[PDB]
Amino acid sequence: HVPPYDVVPSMRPVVLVGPSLKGYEVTDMMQKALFDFLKHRFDGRISITRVTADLSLAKRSVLNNPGKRTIIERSSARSSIAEVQSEIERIFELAKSLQLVVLDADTINHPAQLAKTSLAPIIVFVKVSSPKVLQRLIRSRGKSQMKHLTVQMMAYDKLVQCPPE
Amino acid sequence: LIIIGSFFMLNLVLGVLSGEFAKERERVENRRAFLKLRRQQQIERELN
Lengths: 165, 48
Fold this sequence. Notes:
The structure is cut from a larger assembly and holds chains A and B.
Chain A: E1 14-17, H1 25-41, E2 46-49, H2 81-96, E3 100-103, E4 122-125, H3 131-139, H4 144-147, H5 149-160
Parallel strand pairs in A: 1-3, 1-4, 2-3
Helix pairs in contact in A: 3-5
Chain B: H1 2-25, H2 28-47
């Protein structure tokens, strides 16, 4: 029984999905340069918020109030769902202030992961044209990324095979 | 003697050789090497 209307922020937050995986050097500078230009060119009208916490557990049809208080000692009361739900409305006040905001979420790396939630944000896709250049792009960082390179390619094509729409 | 013997024969030699080099370029084995060269350059441009 999906409602005809859904509550969304008045102003769309912007989330940038990295080439392979966030939290790693190749993606981090791949995101950092765009973040700087958002700060500089649009200074005085854009506010940037970084959330280290997760955002993929944003559900609205699970229960009336899962873990309403921290003293219940419930499984979800002491879990991480408390702060994730508390950060959901944090975006809303920024949207009502008309000053543009982005989502520096370090956990989301795929568009549908944050598509069923009430955020429904603007997803910006930065991608390398081919996997061949990306592999040697990782090589430029150093031997540290060489330990972690293998899973950094599987995260890329899974995001690539997602339809452009 | 100079015009026919030296300048006219030099014209045919350049003509025949140039035709042969054009045909050699479009050989299957030679085209594949160029296609590898073109792809390798495209990577370098994007990587830069």
